[PDB]
Amino acid sequence: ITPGICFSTASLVLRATDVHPLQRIDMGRFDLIGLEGRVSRYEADTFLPRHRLSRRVLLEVATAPDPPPRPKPVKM
Amino acid sequence: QRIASHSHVKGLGLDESGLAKQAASGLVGQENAREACGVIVELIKSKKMAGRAVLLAGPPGTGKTALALAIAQELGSKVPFCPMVGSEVYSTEIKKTEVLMENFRRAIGLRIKETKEVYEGEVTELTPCEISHVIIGLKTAKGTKQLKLDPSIFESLQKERVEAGDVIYIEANSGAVKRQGRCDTYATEFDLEAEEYVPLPKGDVHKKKEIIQDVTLHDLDVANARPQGGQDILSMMGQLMKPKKTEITDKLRGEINKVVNKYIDQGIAELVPGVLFVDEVHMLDIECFTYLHRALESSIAPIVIFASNRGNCVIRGTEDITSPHGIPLDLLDRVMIIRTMLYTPQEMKQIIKIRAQTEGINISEEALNHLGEIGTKTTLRYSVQLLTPANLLAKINGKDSIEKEHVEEISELFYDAKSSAKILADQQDKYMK
Amino acid sequence: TQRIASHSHVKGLGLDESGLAKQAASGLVGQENAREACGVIVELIKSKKMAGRAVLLAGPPGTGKTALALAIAQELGSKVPFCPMVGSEVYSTEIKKTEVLMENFRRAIGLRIKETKEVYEGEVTELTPCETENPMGGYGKTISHVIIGLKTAKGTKQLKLDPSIFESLQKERVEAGDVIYIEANSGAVKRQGRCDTYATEFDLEAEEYVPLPKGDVHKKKEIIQDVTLHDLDVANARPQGGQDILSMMGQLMKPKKTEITDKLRGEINKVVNKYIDQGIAELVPGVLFVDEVHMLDIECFTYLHRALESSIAPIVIFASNRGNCVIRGTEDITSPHGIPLDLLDRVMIIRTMLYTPQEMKQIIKIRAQTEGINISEEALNHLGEIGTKTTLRYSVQLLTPANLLAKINGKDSIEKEHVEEISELFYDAKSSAKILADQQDKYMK
Amino acid sequence: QPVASPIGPRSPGPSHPTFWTYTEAAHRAVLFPQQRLDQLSEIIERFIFVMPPVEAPPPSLHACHPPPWLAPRQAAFQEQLASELWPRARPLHRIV
Amino acid sequence: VTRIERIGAHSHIRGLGLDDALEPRQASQGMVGQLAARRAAGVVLEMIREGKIAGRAVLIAGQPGTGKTAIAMGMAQALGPDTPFTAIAGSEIFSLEMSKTEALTQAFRRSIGVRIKEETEIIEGEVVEIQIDRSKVGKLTLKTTEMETIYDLGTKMIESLTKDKVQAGDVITIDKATGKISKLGRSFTRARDYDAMGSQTKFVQCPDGELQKRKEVVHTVSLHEIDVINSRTQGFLALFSGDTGEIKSEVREQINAKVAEWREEGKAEIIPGVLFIDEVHMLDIESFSFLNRALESDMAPVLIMATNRGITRIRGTSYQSPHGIPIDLLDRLLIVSTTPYSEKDTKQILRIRCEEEDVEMSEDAYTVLTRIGLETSLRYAIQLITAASLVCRKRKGTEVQVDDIKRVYSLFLDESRSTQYMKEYQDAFLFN
Amino acid sequence: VTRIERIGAHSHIRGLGLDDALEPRQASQGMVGQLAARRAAGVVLEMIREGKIAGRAVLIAGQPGTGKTAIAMGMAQALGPDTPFTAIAGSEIFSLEMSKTEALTQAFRRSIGVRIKEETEIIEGEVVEIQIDRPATGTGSKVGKLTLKTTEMETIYDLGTKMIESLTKDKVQAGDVITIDKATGKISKLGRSFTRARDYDAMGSQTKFVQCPDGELQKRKEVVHTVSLHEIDVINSRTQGFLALFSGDTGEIKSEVREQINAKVAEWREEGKAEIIPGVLFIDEVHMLDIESFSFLNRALESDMAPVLIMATNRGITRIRGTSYQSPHGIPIDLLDRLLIVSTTPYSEKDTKQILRIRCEEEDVEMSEDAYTVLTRIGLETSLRYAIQLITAASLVCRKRKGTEVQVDDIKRVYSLFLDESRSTQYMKEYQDAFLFN
Numbered sequence A: 001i002t003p004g005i006c007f008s009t010a011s012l013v014l015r016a017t018d019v020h021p022l023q024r025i026d027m028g029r030f031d032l033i034g035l036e037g038r039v040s041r042y043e044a045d046t047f048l049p050r051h052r053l054s055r056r057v058l059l060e061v062a063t064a065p066d067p068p069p070r071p072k073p074v075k076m
Numbered sequence B: 001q002r003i004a005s006h007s008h009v010k011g012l013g014l015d016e017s018g019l020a021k022q023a024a025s026g027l028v029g030q031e032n033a034r035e036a037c038g039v040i041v042e043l044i045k046s047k048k049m050a051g052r053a054v055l056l057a058g059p060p061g062t063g064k065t066a067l068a069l070a071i072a073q074e075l076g077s078k079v080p081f082c083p084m085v086g087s088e089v090y091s092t093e094i095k096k097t098e099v100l101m102e103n104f105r106r107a108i109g110l111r112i113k114e115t116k117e118v119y120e121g122e123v124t125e126l127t128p129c130e131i132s133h134v135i136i137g138l139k140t141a142k143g144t145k146q147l148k149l150d151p152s153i154f155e156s157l158q159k160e161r162v163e164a165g166d167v168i169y170i171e172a173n174s175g176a177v178k179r180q181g182r183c184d185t186y187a188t189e190f191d192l193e194a195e196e197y198v199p200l201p202k203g204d205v206h207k208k209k210e211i212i213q214d215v216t217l218h219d220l221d222v223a224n225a226r227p228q229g230g231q232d233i234l235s236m237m238g239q240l241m242k243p244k245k246t247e248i249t250d251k252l253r254g255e256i257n258k259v260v261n262k263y264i265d266q267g268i269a270e271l272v273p274g275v276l277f278v279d280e281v282h283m284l285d286i287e288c289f290t291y292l293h294r295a296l297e298s299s300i301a302p303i304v305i306f307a308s309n310r311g312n313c314v315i316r317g318t319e320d321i322t323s324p325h326g327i328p329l330d331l332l333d334r335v336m337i338i339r340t341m342l343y344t345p346q347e348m349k350q351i352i353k354i355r356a357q358t359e360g361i362n363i364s365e366e367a368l369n370h371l372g373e374i375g376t377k378t379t380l381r382y383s384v385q386l387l388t389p390a391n392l393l394a395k396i397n398g399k400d401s402i403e404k405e406h407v408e409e410i411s412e413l414f415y416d417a418k419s420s421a422k423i424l425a426d427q428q429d430k431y432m433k
Numbered sequence C: 001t002q003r004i005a006s007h008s009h010v011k012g013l014g015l016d017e018s019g020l021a022k023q024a025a026s027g028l029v030g031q032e033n034a035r036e037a038c039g040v041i042v043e044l045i046k047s048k049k050m051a052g053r054a055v056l057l058a059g060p061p062g063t064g065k066t067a068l069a070l071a072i073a074q075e076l077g078s079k080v081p082f083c084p085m086v087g088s089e090v091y092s093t094e095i096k097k098t099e100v101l102m103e104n105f106r107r108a109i110g111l112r113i114k115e116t117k118e119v120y121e122g123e124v125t126e127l128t129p130c131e132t133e134n135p136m137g138g139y140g141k142t143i144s145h146v147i148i149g150l151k152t153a154k155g156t157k158q159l160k161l162d163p164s165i166f167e168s169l170q171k172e173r174v175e176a177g178d179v180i181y182i183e184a185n186s187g188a189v190k191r192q193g194r195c196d197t198y199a200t201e202f203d204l205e206a207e208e209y210v211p212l213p214k215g216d217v218h219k220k221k222e223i224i225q226d227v228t229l230h231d232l233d234v235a236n237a238r239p240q241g242g243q244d245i246l247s248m249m250g251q252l253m254k255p256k257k258t259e260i261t262d263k264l265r266g267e268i269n270k271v272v273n274k275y276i277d278q279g280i281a282e283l284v285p286g287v288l289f290v291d292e293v294h295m296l297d298i299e300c301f302t303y304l305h306r307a308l309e310s311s312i313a314p315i316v317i318f319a320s321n322r323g324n325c326v327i328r329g330t331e332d333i334t335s336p337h338g339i340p341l342d343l344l345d346r347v348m349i350i351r352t353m354l355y356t357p358q359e360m361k362q363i364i365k366i367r368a369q370t371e372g373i374n375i376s377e378e379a380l381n382h383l384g385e386i387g388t389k390t391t392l393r394y395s396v397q398l399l400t401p402a403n404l405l406a407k408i409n410g411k412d413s414i415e416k417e418h419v420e421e422i423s424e425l426f427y428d429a430k431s432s433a434k435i436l437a438d439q440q441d442k443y444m445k
Numbered sequence D: 001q002p003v004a005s006p007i008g009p010r011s012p013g014p015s016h017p018t019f020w021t022y023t024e025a026a027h028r029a030v031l032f033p034q035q036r037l038d039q040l041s042e043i044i045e046r047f048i049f050v051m052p053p054v055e056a057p058p059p060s061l062h063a064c065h066p067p068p069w070l071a072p073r074q075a076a077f078q079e080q081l082a083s084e085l086w087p088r089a090r091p092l093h094r095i096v
Numbered sequence E: 001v002t003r004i005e006r007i008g009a010h011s012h013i014r015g016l017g018l019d020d021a022l023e024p025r026q027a028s029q030g031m032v033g034q035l036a037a038r039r040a041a042g043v044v045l046e047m048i049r050e051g052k053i054a055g056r057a058v059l060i061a062g063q064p065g066t067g068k069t070a071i072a073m074g075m076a077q078a079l080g081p082d083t084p085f086t087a088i089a090g091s092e093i094f095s096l097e098m099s100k101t102e103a104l105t106q107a108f109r110r111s112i113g114v115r116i117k118e119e120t121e122i123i124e125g126e127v128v129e130i131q132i133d134r135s136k137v138g139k140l141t142l143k144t145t146e147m148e149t150i151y152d153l154g155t156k157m158i159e160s161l162t163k164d165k166v167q168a169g170d171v172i173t174i175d176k177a178t179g180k181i182s183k184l185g186r187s188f189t190r191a192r193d194y195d196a197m198g199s200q201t202k203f204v205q206c207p208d209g210e211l212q213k214r215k216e217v218v219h220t221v222s223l224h225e226i227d228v229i230n231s232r233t234q235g236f237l238a239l240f241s242g243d244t245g246e247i248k249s250e251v252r253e254q255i256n257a258k259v260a261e262w263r264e265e266g267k268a269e270i271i272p273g274v275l276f277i278d279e280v281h282m283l284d285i286e287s288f289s290f291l292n293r294a295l296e297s298d299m300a301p302v303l304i305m306a307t308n309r310g311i312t313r314i315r316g317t318s319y320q321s322p323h324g325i326p327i328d329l330l331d332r333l334l335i336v337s338t339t340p341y342s343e344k345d346t347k348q349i350l351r352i353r354c355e356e357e358d359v360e361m362s363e364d365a366y367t368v369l370t371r372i373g374l375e376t377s378l379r380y381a382i383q384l385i386t387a388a389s390l391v392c393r394k395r396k397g398t399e400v401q402v403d404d405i406k407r408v409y410s411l412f413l414d415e416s417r418s419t420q421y422m423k424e425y426q427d428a429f430l431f432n
Numbered sequence F: 001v002t003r004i005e006r007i008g009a010h011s012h013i014r015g016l017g018l019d020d021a022l023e024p025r026q027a028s029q030g031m032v033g034q035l036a037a038r039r040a041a042g043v044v045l046e047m048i049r050e051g052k053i054a055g056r057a058v059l060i061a062g063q064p065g066t067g068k069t070a071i072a073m074g075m076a077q078a079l080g081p082d083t084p085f086t087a088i089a090g091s092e093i094f095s096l097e098m099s100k101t102e103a104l105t106q107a108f109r110r111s112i113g114v115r116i117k118e119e120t121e122i123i124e125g126e127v128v129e130i131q132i133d134r135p136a137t138g139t140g141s142k143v144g145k146l147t148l149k150t151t152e153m154e155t156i157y158d159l160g161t162k163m164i165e166s167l168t169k170d171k172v173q174a175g176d177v178i179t180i181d182k183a184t185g186k187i188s189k190l191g192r193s194f195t196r197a198r199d200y201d202a203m204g205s206q207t208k209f210v211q212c213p214d215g216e217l218q219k220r221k222e223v224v225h226t227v228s229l230h231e232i233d234v235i236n237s238r239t240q241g242f243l244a245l246f247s248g249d250t251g252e253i254k255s256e257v258r259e260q261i262n263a264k265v266a267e268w269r270e271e272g273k274a275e276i277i278p279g280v281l282f283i284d285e286v287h288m289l290d291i292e293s294f295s296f297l298n299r300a301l302e303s304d305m306a307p308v309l310i311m312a313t314n315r316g317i318t319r320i321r322g323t324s325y326q327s328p329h330g331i332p333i334d335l336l337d338r339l340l341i342v343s344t345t346p347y348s349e350k351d352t353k354q355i356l357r358i359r360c361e362e363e364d365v366e367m368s369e370d371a372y373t374v375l376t377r378i379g380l381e382t383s384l385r386y387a388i389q390l391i392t393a394a395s396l397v398c399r400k401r402k403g404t405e406v407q408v409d410d411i412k413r414v415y416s417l418f419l420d421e422s423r424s425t426q427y428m429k430e431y432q433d434a435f436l437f438n
């Protein structure tokens, strides 16, 4: 049994590939392979074109007061 | 023990002054070559020079490989001796230069002192301690001890199904847990338990043993390039997903050099430079020869013995470049050439007699003379190979010794290369291609 | 199946019951001697008592070698394995050529397995232990059977089972109203969901509710499964379905063909022999058809000697249209069919001849019938004349362009003018070669 | 999942056509790795003896001021991989 | 703006320029001349559209620059995007990962399209409440803009809901047959005004209509895609990476049978297409031998090929054959020959290229450029079109004149002039 | 029913057909003629059986169809299954997974068998009554009792927890004849002495019974484990090696592993734990090996773990593969010096007729004397293999016409239907232009 090899390097080397978020764009807008097994044709083709939010709806919901409390169930 | 082609070669048969006795240690001739090999053996034993190359040159059957194995026998089993054939560099996993470099490091051995820490006893308490550690109680015939061990050791104990009453062996260095059996004291409780019982250990619970380990530089390189000592999931993953050899870098070899130098300085390691032997060197190509230039120029390299029976032959990997031994002239400038000669009929008879004695065969003088005559034509190898079939024929006929009739009958049954060549030439139109 | 391929008209060898070849039958025209020899080879395959026998179909291109092999396959039927293969396929980036050949050899040896699967289906109506009036040991209750009531669409049956099934029933969480099946050959209970009659429209479970089984509670059937030795070899070399780390690695890693060892193949042979002796399985030795055998190299040809000498090998059919060509992998060694003379000594050669104009006209008419094309007598004669020159393949390939051209012109049959226009539009090999030779400077290389 | 195999997929029951297509004889001619290990237990106990001459842990990368997120990320990855895969490696215990 | 598709060598070709009788017009849809070849291409295109006959091979042969690839692009354009058209070069079958026959098999199976049609019942709504008792049983409330209902959950449904961490406000769909849950988005409320959002969260409107819905999905996949999907556990990943390897023939046979079953059941339709191999002379003898018998399958598309070789050497052999293709394969295919263009055809092609690139040229410039194209080559004149346009724009001109064409002729050399200049200084260049 | 093994080329060869003095009989055990070659093969077989000399090489050389492979198969059949016999072709060493030297090393090591013999205590009996008491709920110690019976004994065993678990997993019931190994606790069911209760349902059709074992319950039996050096190398190369025993995929085994195995096997041999059973490697068509492979063969035969190597080649003075050198048999002269060569002479008329008779007997084909004469003439004119193929061809033609004995007409019919190399080459010369490349 031998001790492992302790390989020492400069701390700056481990940050060579790191880029600050304010210096890089969002690559998730080109992520096609990440959608497989998670996103369906229904969501992309039928649902989202109909049920996308609009700025008007978002503003109306944000400005409107809280909805009334949901009524308690009644056996009727 | 089976009798191989070189089983009679026990040494170089040299006297105290270095001169070669005529017949000694299973060697009959090649006195000049044996004396040169004695000098090479002294060079290897000096452990001072690095990368010194020797070429054994001569026709086939002149005992080049016998002389290399005799050098091995003179050195002893402690000194590494790596035999490789030139055809073995053509691997489908790593480059030819990598194969050569790995064989170079295999020739350098290292005797290193190591201390093994052992926990051995019957388990009396196995209490997890919340990742969960283990508190274990071990008893022997001399005492009892309680130990706190790492969670990895607890996982190993669980995998071994160790329960209270089992005799276990723990190696603290490698964390290797072995369950040996249920203690013998419980062997009477049942009639069919499906258990293997083991007596109680009779020493102490904790032992320290110092042993000498024989390793090579290649072993260290492999251990640090394909690690399996962490016992973690990543090591298993790397072993299963990457089982092939890899081209170990010069950086790893430099680190191993530093580690071994540190060990030698600490006084716990001894270096044995050792020998590499390449038998069919002409099978290497020009890339291998060019690499061997720089490899032999290294101050870490071992002593390399090369062999060749080729004449003025085209170097493999070149189109039409022809060199004296199949070896480019640049590498021949870096080698000491030991020349082997053809054997006289008397030496052939001596070798035949030695091989007969080695194979446990009694041969009459008339049969020995006839077989030496058979070896004068054809080859010595062919004459030696007729000993066992002739013995089998004599045994079938009820004779305990080989007579001339058995040798004649066997030679009639089996042809040599020249006779087969004559048959092929006479009937070229009937054989394929 | 609906699309028409080049050998869609070959329905077998047009052989009389005595083996003589009819002039035109089963889609085949002429080649009477070759067809008779192929019928003898079909009898050899059906006899199932010979191994490693090889047949070479030798003749000029377009003489029915592939058509004859496919006719043999039609004669044998789908029961007999028939593994087509071209010689270029042995060159793989994953396994060696000998391994490809061995795998194709094992694909041709089939195995037919017959077993009876007896099951008891039903919805559990009753689950009652059968206690004993004398409890063993004096205390507690002892049970000797467990009565399970199984209900199906057209019946209801009760089963007095072993007491040991109580553990299986609890492990499967079988209760009344659940649909289960019990296998006689194993004595195990499997819960295939709950009956759908107890499901409400407001439930959201997906695989929990199952329809009440139709038919009888006791279902038994004979299962015939056809497998090949290569299937067993591959399934054992790279097994699928384990839960250990090695199976997980197999699922993760990219699949790759491996060099299956003689140990695994010998084990498969032993298992197959055991099944045959038990009466479970019947061996179905088939045919390996290796088209373009001349594309094999000298290593493949040499390996074929040992492969054919084996007692497990199928009957191999080769085909080569080469003359005194140079064997691949060798430097300037010429052999009569591109095949070394050592392998020619191990094969029976069937010769295919060229077609007379009448046979070409018959084949063209058959191909037109297969493609759903009506062709006039004058157009057929012109196309046969075109086939006398050029080749037969060229003439049969003008049928669909001429039919399309007629349909565009508004006619339901091919006339001579349509064939003439198609012949003007499309060139054959010889005419193109004449153009190339006449203008060799303007072309490349 | 088992495409083109003598082993059939997991049929829900006899109502499915796959139930009556595959045989138990074909299933018993295919051995999983665990069955292979059970078949070679005596061979594993008697003929598996070769030990590497040297044993080392993997080389470790050390920096004075590393990114403080690299080590915890590697630790979490290793922990998850071990928790998912170590139970599956238990059959190979005797070989190791 | 500048889109990713820009002016290429065949951007001016929109079709084969034929009428209803497949008679080629002199200049239609961007094609000039090659009347016989275009008519043959149209006949082959009708054969492709019918789809009845399998494994038909056509070779477009002719001198370099005679419109072979132009005709192939015209066939591809005239053929709808619905019908597959796999265009590969001969060199692309030499792969380090799979054999040549495997590459050709994958190319063949990429040329057959399978259009699937699945109809599935789903539940679609916004999650209002999830109550789980203790996790054996629970209730789920879903709502739309016009409906609201409560569902009783089982063990597996509860486990699936907990695994996906479905909570209130999530807009989800549940497949009735399989029970799988996919999250479409979440509803926006006043309290969900997040300052930071996860990479997958998105706000959607609550669905309207009825909670139970039918989902119809129609998509076109090729046989190669189905092969890759079923090659391994996550084989669809190889449709992005390309690390397919050599797919087992048994898998391909199973998929052929399954596709036939789908076709009988009405769940799939087969659209055989075209495999165009450009510069086939790069194929080796093994590839040609494989092509001989690959075309004989019932699932073989139309193989269109194009070579400009005369009687040359077959790759991998020492034999000479009329197109570099062995005569055995040449008997399996119909040859469409392209003739050299005349002066009128060259001028018309130059006019079409100038219109495509939006370059104005004088008639004298057109005459000079046509003379250059006849003397050197048509492609050289086509390149000079853009060169002269740039030079004209540099001197603040609006129409290319003869001076611009002469200037770019002096600046840029064709092969003949460059070869002459090299021969003048032959010793300067290396390895003559 | 037809087994997986059918009538092949060498199915009639059951051995070399020699007497005690290794003198070949004219026709015995399928072999006909080749007296000198068969005697040499017998001497080599005795050398193999003695198993004392390592790395002996024999070359069987002769014209095509002279019985080289027949002699090799006779040697294999005379050796028996106890001694390993690895038969490969020369082409098989060219592999994309491993080097040629590695493939040759594995082939060599597949031809040496290591056998471990040990004695173990074994309990074999008929289960009379088994009782297992387990806690109703929660973890607890199962207690059980087992009764085993032979014809002369009956003992009641108190069972431990692990034996209880083994019996529960094997589902051991009364009347089951079981075998128990005391050390490992493995239980193997080998039959039922009688049927289960009839009143039970879903039990299936009861098979045949097995007679109860006699003698004492706990006997001592000798267990023999035999593996080859290659199997040890593969299972020791890596953790997943045991799967590599079936999938191949061994890669290149480290030389360190092989050296350790050689040392351990030598130690076992010295300690009496294991015996080495050297075998034979038969490389058919050795001329496909290149110079690198031959160079490896030269030195690999010098090991004490090397088997007997038998090669077959029908080449004359031919170019060695991978070189431009002409050598006898396509083999370098350095390797030809290390081996004895056994020449096979061509067959005469009577030997050909006797071979045809043996083939007809193996194929269960009845032939007339005139048909034998015509077939022997055809075999002398064309080749032996062609006549052998015509045997079954004419059998099928005769069976088609509802006959019982193969006549001259059937042989003529198959001679017309199936062509030899000579007539095919003649007909191809007649239409030389129609064939593609000449």
Ligand SMILES: Nc1ncnc2c1ncn2[C@@H]1O[C@H](COP(=O)(O)OP(=O)(O)O)[C@@H](O)[C@H]1O
Binding pocket: B005, B006, B007, B009, B026, B027, B028, B029, B030, B059, B060, B061, B062, B063, B064, B065, B066, B067, B309, B351, B354, B381
């Ligand atoms: N001087 C010698 N004395 C005894 N045996 C010898 C001698 N030289 C060679 N031999 C034996 O004869 C055989 C041929 O020698 P070898 O070393 O193989 O020649 P090569 O130089 O061709 O390798 C071997 O069995 C070897 O042990």
Ligand SMILES: Nc1ncnc2c1ncn2[C@@H]1O[C@H](COP(=O)(O)OP(=O)(O)O)[C@@H](O)[C@H]1O
Binding pocket: C006, C007, C008, C010, C027, C028, C029, C030, C031, C060, C061, C062, C063, C064, C065, C066, C067, C068, C321, C363, C393
């Ligand atoms: N005797 C025949 N009867 C009917 N069709 C034939 C006959 N011979 C060839 N064909 C057909 O002609 C075409 C030529 O292919 P084929 O003859 O198989 O070429 P090859 O023999 O060179 O492989 C195929 O469509 C084949 O079905």
Ligand SMILES: Nc1ncnc2c1ncn2[C@@H]1O[C@H](COP(=O)(O)OP(=O)(O)O)[C@@H](O)[C@H]1O
Binding pocket: E009, E010, E030, E031, E032, E033, E034, E063, E064, E065, E066, E067, E068, E069, E070, E071, E308, E349, E352, E378, E379, E382
């Ligand atoms: N008939 C045609 N109509 C329009 N453009 C053509 C025509 N023939 C060739 N071209 C154009 O000339 C160039 C060369 O023709 P191309 O078909 O690529 O040559 P090749 O036939 O040698 O492949 C391309 O830019 C192509 O668009």
Ligand SMILES: Nc1ncnc2c1ncn2[C@@H]1O[C@H](COP(=O)(O)OP(=O)(O)O)[C@@H](O)[C@H]1O
Binding pocket: F009, F010, F011, F013, F030, F031, F032, F033, F034, F062, F063, F064, F065, F066, F067, F068, F069, F070, F071, F314, F355, F384, F385, F388
């Ligand atoms: N002496 C013999 N005795 C019996 N059968 C033989 C004999 N010689 C050849 N045969 C048979 O004839 C065929 C050709 O012989 P084979 O050994 O294959 O020739 P080769 O020397 O080319 O290997 C085989 O079927 C073989 O079994």
Ligand SMILES: [Mg+2]
Binding pocket: E068, E069, E278
């Ligand atoms: Mg082009």
Ligand SMILES: [Mg+2]
Binding pocket: C305, F068, F069, F284, F312
């Ligand atoms: Mg042979």
